[PDB]
């Protein structure tokens, strides 16, 4: 399955990048997920586009890796990121370990 | 290719042009749904017009089942025998199964839609496309249907529509070329099947893709649907590939008509000089769009003839006026003035041609007015090199294209051979 | 769009039936999906449903031990639980795929889960 | 040509027929206005009559504009090459220059003319005739629809009329033959060309003219008109030229089947003994009609066989089922009685055939009842029999129409020759 | 035929199949009536439909009925000239005379009533069936006369249908093949002639009889009826007959690609080892169905080649990619590995043939998984067995299929022999 950084922390501002790599994403879009601990996850980036509710961050897909780039730090972003993709065959979905983030 | 010193023999090289090849394909998957969707009550004639369609596809579900040779139970890791014309044919069909779980997922959705063309897809480049049956006109007849007030007397317009569509079908389905599929829906391949480098198309590129062979890979009776795996091309401008069309005229020898039997086209590709069979390629303004590399090597004679040394060319004997006797080489005119009258300037000034010369080049403005067995013209330039008269071109290789003459001649060659040994 | 019903308390080897109702949501026109989240781990994949009941896709421990049922009449999504053992103690979210009949462009992607319901509790003693 | 004494080998010449050639074509001009006309009020079907015509028009004008690469830049009275066939069909394109006045003058009048066919001629030859497509049927649709059209009994009625029309229009406008040009409008050639040129052809003659080719010379995108330069024929009976159909039968040598490979037709023209072609030609009750002079020279051995000396015919091995092995000459029966059962005056009374001889002739009521392979017939009374020259023919020109056979043969002719030098 | 030891030269005999011939023919009389029947009111003035056939059948009566050769006026207990093929055809026409009286008996009754198909029978081997044009379609649209409350839009619906049907008629009437007679009426051949000689037909067998030519014997312009003497075959299974499909592979020599030019199919009848044809035949699951015996004798070289004597086989140079160069014979691939990239168990393990051997034999006992110029395949277990160590296999039989090349080569041969005695 696809993997990513276990966790990362920054100060209260500047910008933040979250990585993602695996045997997938070479020919498949990415769906980055955040959930505030204790709440249901939310979608931020489906395909290359962005959800309107999110502007603030759009991410960047690469040849073999994915990367979601976010800027600033507020009462948001104190939660991990799940990097997900469609299965290689088209049946399942794959989820990586949450990259815990603190401002 | 040597164009000069070649007009004097009757070989008239024509129109240097480029070359393009479809060396690799970007496959897609067309999914035709042969039933339209109606968005108001019912159309009482749907069942009957449905029944007409039942005659066609019911033939196709066993047209595939019981026809597959099962050449690949091995999956691209009792076959009996199968050739490369099928290897590539079904290995590309092996990829259908991996997309079968994907194509079926759309087939569950397009069934309930009311849209003509949908280009839903998974990978970044590849995209499956769904085409309904007559949904284009259905939206243009259900909208008037509010004025006609009925499942019929309204659906009658639908009733004639699908029957006409059925009349359109069974024509190319009775190896289908892409033109037919576009013909049913009045659409065109640049509107639905163009992405990334497969999007920018010329007008000649458009027809070549329509001329490719489309394969049927699945028919579902319940959905009345057909799955088509097309192979959209990527045409690279192959370098140093010039395709010169070649024509021949009646090079005279002692009042008898002979001509040099070159093929339909000739190419120069580095050292490669052999001809071509361009019966399949779509001709462009300045290039040829070929699926494969049609080049086949010529003889040594017909390849030494086209690099000059015209003292090697084959010399057929004319039978029936299929080969011309006069043609417009550049601004000037080249003709076999012994058999056809050239006359130069004066209409009555019939110019003599020596019996040992095949065709007389009329250019360099010696005849500013030229009448070929009548008519009148005016030469311009570049048809010759200062009225270029070559040496006595003695042609040696006289060849006959009928098997009877070849057989008869060797019979004499066989007969005297027996006499020769004593 | 809101989608959750909740309710579950079982014993190892037992059975259960989770459900979620997508109020204010075109249930028949849009697909469905469930996702499992272990309390000490991240999310993971369990089972998939199409807009109609035609295709059922499962990855329950990468095998078949659960059955998830779609019902367009009452617009509810039901998952049948049985033979829980040492691998199912987690929370469950009812999820709805982003794509659907009006916008099928993303139908081929089953991981574009648009909106997720509140987590429900299951326990393996 | 001697039909008699030619039947003793199998070269079995059929009945003579006449010859006709269209030497001097005379040209006429067509104007196909692919649009109907509504007499009084704007209907609700004319909105779509143009829209379905979008596809056909713009696949014509760029294909035509690119088509006419100028081959006669220099006027009558930078070319590359144009063969005699090209320029001969290019000068005919020039003739539109002088007629454009009436071409435009009439087309201006046809802009609103409510007539299916209109003809105005500055000269009866090189005249102009215009056709307004289904406007004749539009004159039939308006009659009832003037009272109950309701946009349904006329709009859909006219819509389906042109939709079916547009379907057929796309078929024959996709180099056209006159049949489509005539059939698509449900009129024959005699009406559309009412002059003193078509009222002279035989009933079996005007069918040939409908097979002639038709060019296109002008297309406009305003009225969608298409201008057609037809080359109507003026056929001459020629003279001393008759077409003999020729058939062969299984001349049997030593129990093996052989036959003489004659062409499908033979013509005699003074000293021009033979060779013929009919695939282009049409045939009347007693005459063939050809655009060209199809006669082509035969081989000297091939021609000498038809000249009377029979011992030099070519002899071909029969493969299977391509040689009749028995045929009915005038008032008689000629057959290979070894291969096929010849019974005389009774099923059980079989004819014996000398193995050395070829086919055996039964005529002059030698057998008043003759049974081919057990099927009794009665010999007629006018038949001509000729048993003279029972001398064994001894054909020696043995030919094979398969290039593999020839190639293998000369390998033996080579392998037995290389050591002959030593 | 031996398949093993023949794969060493790239000849891949397919699976054996049976040979069924149509040795005996039934006989039936289709009596088509191209005019439907309406209850009353002229189908709301549809008689205009009747005019369309007048453009079609009126030319038929002089096309066939007006002019025959009348080859059988002699008793069937000048004629002109006809071959056996015409005679066999002529005999069938005489058979219609015996059953002629019955034809008008049904023709007297078909003119009335409204049932689409009628069948009467006079002898156990000769029944007659009557088919109306579009009567079945008419049988359902008669209710719309009152159900839709209008003769119009029903007669108009009838008119376009016959217009479509007339267009359907004109396709193959513009010889006749029964699929027309089926598809024009869109029907079932099993629903026709209702005979024990047609019920026991396999789908492949039933497909073959759809291809046999249908004849025309009579036309009745008064009733627009066409009487077709349709022939049904009795498909006996000719025993001791094996049909193989044969392919060729690039047996390379010194990096030059040659191949062995076998026919499309090969047959074996006891000792008769000639080729075959399938263009007129039909492919079944386990047999071949043909209306004749396509077997034709091959050359001695090409017959001794297939009998295990493999040194003498024709050996032609390859031109263009028409030879697969690799194929799946049995389970183990055989190919020309110095033209296609051969591998075992991985991309990096290329296979190199010796500079003398041609194609290479690859088996699951030697190569478990094999990829060819890309791709990858595991070798399924099957009958192909090892290299088997044939000795150096020299081929002595260069064969060129260019008439020009044959003519060019013997000119040198003639040149050599002219000086051989000086
Ligand atoms: C294809 O059809 C579309 C439909 O409007 C049109 O806009 C486009 O120009 C067409 N392209 C070609 C190459 O004909
Ligand atoms: C004529 O020139 C060609 C160039 O390819 C050469 O191959 C040929 O041998 C020359 N003439 C002869 C017959 O030597
Ligand atoms: C061709 O023929 C001429 C005379 O007929 C001769 O001089 C010449 O050498 C021949 N060409 C060749 C290549 O032998
Ligand atoms: C052409 O058709 C008309 C009817 O429109 C008819 O009077 C005329 O005889 C026909 N001519 C020929 C040659 O068929
Ligand atoms: C054919 O026959 C004539 C007369 O019998 C004979 O003079 C002639 O030489 C023969 N043909 C040829 C080509 O020799
Ligand atoms: C034909 O060949 C035979 C021998 O088979 C011989 O007797 C006869 O003289 C030959 N005739 C001719 C014209 O070659
Ligand atoms: C035609 O015959 C019947 C109609 O009675 C139809 O069901 C059948 O499928 C058709 N023929 C075959 C060979 O299936
Ligand atoms: C057949 O094989 C034998 C020995 O195997 C060989 O001598 C002969 O040349 C081959 N061909 C023929 C036609 O005998
Ligand atoms: C075939 O050719 C080779 C060498 O070219 C020779 O050794 C062999 O004897 C030939 N075979 C026959 C049957 O003549």
What are the angstrom distances between the C-alpha of B194 and each of B188, B190, B191, D198?
10, 6, 7, 52
3-class SS of residue D215: coil
Binding site membership of E396 for ligand 9 (Cβ less than 6 Å): yes
Q: What is the DSSP string of B319-371?
A: -STTS-SEE--SSSEEE-TTTS----SSTT------TT-S-EEE-TTSSSSB-
Partner-chain contact B120 C108, CB within 8 Å? yes
Tell how strand C2-3 and strand C15-23 pair up.
antiparallel
Q: Which of E154, E285, E323, E403 to mutate to test the interface with B (most CBs of B within 10 A)?
A: E403
Measured distance between the N- and C-terminal CA atoms of chain A, rounded to whole angstroms: 28
- Count of all residues that appear for chain E in the document: 422
**D199: which DSSP letter?**
T
Q: State whether residue B328 sits within 8 Å of chain D by CB.
A: yes
Measured distance between the N- and C-terminal CA atoms of chain D, rounded to whole angstroms: 48
Residue owning the nearest CA to atom 1 of ligand 8: E309
DSSP lists the bridge partners of residue D315 as: D398
Cα-flanking dihedrals φ and ψ of residue E249, to 5°? -135, 150
CB of D274 closer than 8 Å to CB of D13: no
| Contacts (Cβ under 8 Å, ≥6 apart) of E123 | none
Residue of B119, C98, C117, B123 whose CA lies nearest to A46: C98
Residue of D331, D263, D248 whose CA lies nearest to D297: D263
What are the angstrom distances between the C-alpha of B306 and each of B12, B244, B273, D52, E292?
11, 11, 8, 50, 48
Domains and CATH numbers, chain C: 2-122 (2.60.40.10)
- Give helix D155-172 / helix D135-148 axis angle, nearest 10°: 170
CB of E252 closer than 8 Å to CB of E297: no
Residue of B266, B361, B277 whose CA lies nearest to B307: B266
Cα-flanking dihedrals φ and ψ of residue B346, to 5°? -70, 130
Tokens (6 digits) for D272: 């021009």
Q: Name the residue range of residue A44's domain.
A: 3-101
Distance between CA atoms of B391 and B249, rounded to whole angstroms? 19
CB of D96 closer than 8 Å to CB of D103: yes
Residue position matching structure tokens 């007397």: B153
DSSP lists the bridge partners of residue E335 as: E326, E360
DSSP lists the bridge partners of residue D219 as: D226
Tokens (6 digits) for E17: 């199949």
Distance between CA atoms of B92 and B231, rounded to whole angstroms? 9
Other beta carbons less than 10 A from residue E196's beta carbon: 6
Surface-to-core class of residue E84, CB atoms within 10 Å of its CB (0-12 exposed, 13-18 middle, 19+ buried) = buried
Distance between CA atoms of E191 and E30, rounded to whole angstroms? 13
Residue position matching structure tokens 């627009």: E224
| Contacts (Cβ under 8 Å, ≥6 apart) of C43 | A33, A41, A82, A84, A95, C35, C36, C37
**B314: which DSSP letter?**
B
CB of E342 closer than 8 Å to CB of E370: yes
CB of D18 closer than 8 Å to CB of D288: yes
DSSP lists the bridge partners of residue B362 as: B333
Residue position matching structure tokens 């024990």: E196
Q: Which of A31, A41, A87, A94 to mutate to test the interface with C (most CBs of C within 10 A)?
A: A41
What are the angstrom distances between the C-alpha of B82 and each of B192, B277, E248, E334?
35, 26, 11, 11
Tokens (6 digits) for D404: 């593999």
Sign of CA dihedral D252, D258, D262, D265: positive
What are the angstrom distances between the C-alpha of C111 and each of A85, A90, C46?
6, 10, 12
Residue position matching structure tokens 């999914």: B31
Surface-to-core class of residue B374, CB atoms within 10 Å of its CB (0-12 exposed, 13-18 middle, 19+ buried) = exposed
CB of E196 closer than 8 Å to CB of E189: no
Cα-flanking dihedrals φ and ψ of residue E234, to 5°? -110, 105
Alpha carbon E37 to chain centroid, angstroms? 37
Q: Which of C57, C100, C108, C110 to mutate to test the interface with B (most CBs of B within 10 A)?
A: C108
Measured distance between the N- and C-terminal CA atoms of chain B, rounded to whole angstroms: 48
Tokens (6 digits) for D337: 């009685």
Surface-to-core class of residue E92, CB atoms within 10 Å of its CB (0-12 exposed, 13-18 middle, 19+ buried) = middle
Other beta carbons less than 10 A from residue D366's beta carbon: 17
**Closest-CA distance of chain B to residue A93, Å:** 13
Surface-to-core class of residue E203, CB atoms within 10 Å of its CB (0-12 exposed, 13-18 middle, 19+ buried) = exposed
- Count of all residues that appear for chain C in the document: 125
Partner-chain contact C101 B122, CB within 8 Å? no
Distance between CA atoms of B64 and B216, rounded to whole angstroms? 9
Partner-chain contact D413 B408, CB within 8 Å? no
**Closest-CA distance of chain E to residue B84, Å:** 5
Tokens (6 digits) for D156: 């859909």
Residue of E331, E321, E376, E371 whose CA lies nearest to E351: E371
CB of D336 closer than 8 Å to CB of D257: yes
Tokens (6 digits) for C2: 């809101």
CB of B26 closer than 8 Å to CB of B235: no
Residue E234 parent element (H or E): strand E233-248
CB of E333 closer than 8 Å to CB of E372: yes
Residue position matching structure tokens 């090849």: B21
Distance between CA atoms of D193 and D339, rounded to whole angstroms? 56
**Closest-CA distance of chain C to residue A94, Å:** 7
Residue of D370, D262, D341 whose CA lies nearest to D12: D262
Residue D270 parent element (H or E): none
Distance between CA atoms of D420 and B133, rounded to whole angstroms? 75
Ligand 4 nearest-atom number relative to CA D203 = 13
Q: Which residues line ligand 5 (CB under 6 A)?
A: D 304, 309, 312
Cα-flanking dihedrals φ and ψ of residue E12, to 5°? -120, 90
3-class SS of residue E341: coil
What are the angstrom distances between the C-alpha of E254 and each of D106, D137, E357?
72, 73, 9
Q: How far is the CA of D309 from the centre of ligand 5 (A)?
A: 6
Q: Which residues line ligand 6 (CB under 6 A)?
A: D 311, 394, 396
Longest Cα–Cα distance in chain C: 44
CB of D80 closer than 8 Å to CB of D4: no
Give the residue ranges of DSSP H helices in E62-121. Answer: 84-110
Cα-flanking dihedrals φ and ψ of residue E91, to 5°? -60, -40
Q: Own/partner pairs for D137-145, CB < 8 Å, 24+ apart?
A: D137/D161, D138/D36, D138/D37, D138/D38, D138/D39, D139/D39, D139/D114, D142/D38, D142/D39, D142/D40, D144/E152
Q: State whether residue C28 sits within 8 Å of chain B by CB.
A: no
Alpha carbon D413 to chain centroid, angstroms? 42
CB of B295 closer than 8 Å to CB of B235: no
What are the angstrom distances between the C-alpha of D10 and each of B74, B403, D241, D359, E69?
59, 21, 24, 7, 21
- Count of all residues that appear for chain D in the document: 422
Distance between CA atoms of C19 and C37, rounded to whole angstroms? 17
User: Chain C contacts of B121, Cβ < 8 Å?
Assistant: 105, 108
CA atoms within 13 A on the CB side of E95: 18
Residue of D244, D308, D232 whose CA lies nearest to D276: D244
Tokens (6 digits) for A10: 């920054």
3-class SS of residue E146: helix
Cα-flanking dihedrals φ and ψ of residue A42, to 5°? -130, 150
Tokens (6 digits) for B155: 């659906």
**E62: which DSSP letter?**
I
Residue of B74, B124, B93 whose CA lies nearest to B231: B93
Note the ligand closest to the C-alpha atom of D204. Answer: 4
Residue of C76, C36, C42 whose CA lies nearest to C60: C36
Residue of E202, E184, E201 whose CA lies nearest to E193: E201
Ligand 9 nearest-atom number relative to CA E311 = 13
Q: What is the DSSP string of A61-81?
A: E-SSEEEEEEE--SSS--S-E
What are the angstrom distances between the C-alpha of D289 and each of C103, D21, D27, D182, D233?
66, 6, 19, 20, 11
Q: How was this structure determined?
A: cryo-EM
Residue of E82, E210, E81, E191 whose CA lies nearest to E136: E191
- Count of all residues that appear for chain B in the document: 422
CB of C18 closer than 8 Å to CB of C78: yes
Instruction: Write the CATH number for A75.
Output: 2.60.40.10
Residue position matching structure tokens 């015409």: E86
CB of B398 closer than 8 Å to CB of D398: no
CB of D287 closer than 8 Å to CB of D19: yes
| Contacts (Cβ under 8 Å, ≥6 apart) of E100 | none
3-class SS of residue D83: coil
CB of D386 closer than 8 Å to CB of D395: no
Tell how strand B213-220 and strand B176-177 pair up.
antiparallel
**D134: which DSSP letter?**
T
Sign of CA dihedral E99, E102, E108, E111: negative
CB of C30 closer than 8 Å to CB of C99: yes
CB of E208 closer than 8 Å to CB of E282: yes
Tokens (6 digits) for C3: 């989608």
Distance between CA atoms of D93 and E231, rounded to whole angstroms? 52
Residue of A73, E404, D133, C108 whose CA lies nearest to B126: C108
Residue of D232, D398, D250 whose CA lies nearest to D315: D398
Number of compact structural domains in chain A: 1
CB of E34 closer than 8 Å to CB of E53: yes
Residue position matching structure tokens 């030269």: E9
């Amino acid at each position: 399955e696809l993997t990513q950084d276990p966790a990362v922390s920054v100060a209260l501002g500047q910008t933040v990048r979250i990585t993602c790599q695996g045997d997938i994403l070479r020919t498949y879009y990415v769906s980055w997920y955040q959930q505030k601990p204790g709440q249901a996850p939310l979608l931020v980036i489906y395909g290359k586009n962005n959800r309107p509710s999110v502007d603030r961050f759009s991410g960047s897909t690469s040849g073999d890796t994915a990367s979601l780039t976010i800027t600033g730090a507020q009462a948001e972003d104190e939660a991990e990121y799940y990097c997900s993709s469609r299965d290689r065959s088209g049946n399942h979905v794959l989820f990586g370990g949450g990259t815990k983030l603190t401002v | 290719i040597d164009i000069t010193k070649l007009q004097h023999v009757g070989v008239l090289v024509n129109s240097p042009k480029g070359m393009k090849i479809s060396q690799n394909f970007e496959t897609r998957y067309l999914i035709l749904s042969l039933i339209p969707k109606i968005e108001d009550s019912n159309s009482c004639g749907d069942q009957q017009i449905k029944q007409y369609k039942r005659l066609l596809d019911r033939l196709i579900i066993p047209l595939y089942d019981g026809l597959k040779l099962q050449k690949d139970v091995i999956v691209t890791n009792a076959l009996g025998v199968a050739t490369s014309a099928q290897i590539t044919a079904a290995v590309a069909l092996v990829e259908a199964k991996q997309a079968k779980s994907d194509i079926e997922k759309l087939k569950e959705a397009i069934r309930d839609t009311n849209k003509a063309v949908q280009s839903v897809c998974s990978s970044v480049g590849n995209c499956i496309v769904a085409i309904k049956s007559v949904q284009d006109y259905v939206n243009k007849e259900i909208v008037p249907s509010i004025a006609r007030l009925g499942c019929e007397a309204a659906g009658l317009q639908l009733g004639i529509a699908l029957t006409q569509h059925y009349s359109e079908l069974t024509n190319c389905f009775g190896g289908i070329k892409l033109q037919c599929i576009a013909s049913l829906y009045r659409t065109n391949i640049t509107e639905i099947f163009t992405t990334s480098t497969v999007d920018k198309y010329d007008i000649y590129d458009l027809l070549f893709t329509e001329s490719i062979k489309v394969r049927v890979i699945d028919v579902d009776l319940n959905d009345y649907s057909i799955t088509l795996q097309v192979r959209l091309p990527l045409l690279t401008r192959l370098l140093n590939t010039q395709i010169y069309k070649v024509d021949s005229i009646s090079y005279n020898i002692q009042n008898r008509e002979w001509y040099i039997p070159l093929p339909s086209h000739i190419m120069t590709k580095g050292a490669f000089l052999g001809g071509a069979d361009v019966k399949e390629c779509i001709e462009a303004f300045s290039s040829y769009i070929c699926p494969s590399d049609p080049g086949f090597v010529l003889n040594h004679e017909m390849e030494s003839c086209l690099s000059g040394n015209i003292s090697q060319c084959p010399r057929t004997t004319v039978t029936s006026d299929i080969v011309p006797r006069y043609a417009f080489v550049n601004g000037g005119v080249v003709a076999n003035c012994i058999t056809t009258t050239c006359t130069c300037n004066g209409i009555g000034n019939r110019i003599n041609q020596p019996p040992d010369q095949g065709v007389k080049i009329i250019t360099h403005k010696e005849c500013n007015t030229i009448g070929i067995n009548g008519m009148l013209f005016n030469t311009n330039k570049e048809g010759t090199l200062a009225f270029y008269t070559p040496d006595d071109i003695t042609l040696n290789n006289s060849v006959a294209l009928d098997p009877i003459d070849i057989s008869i001649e060797l019979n004499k060659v066989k007969s005297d051979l027996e006499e020769s040994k004593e | 769009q809101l989608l959750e019903s909740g309710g579950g308390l079982v014993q190892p080897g037992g059975s259960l039936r989770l459900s979620c109702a997508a109020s204010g949501f075109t249930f028949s026109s849009f697909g469905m999906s469930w996702v499992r989240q272990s309390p000490g781990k991240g999310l993971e994949w369990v089972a998939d449903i199409s807009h109609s009941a035609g295709f059922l896709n499962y990855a329950d421990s990468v095998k078949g031990r659960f059955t998830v049922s779609r019902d367009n009449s009452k617009s509810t999504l039901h998952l049948q639980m049985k033979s829980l053992r040492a691998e199912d103690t987690a929370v469950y979210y009812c999820a709805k795929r982003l794509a659907g009949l009006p916008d099928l462009e993303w139908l081929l992607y089953p991981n574009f889960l648009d909106h997720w319901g509140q987590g429900t509790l299951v326990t393996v003693s």
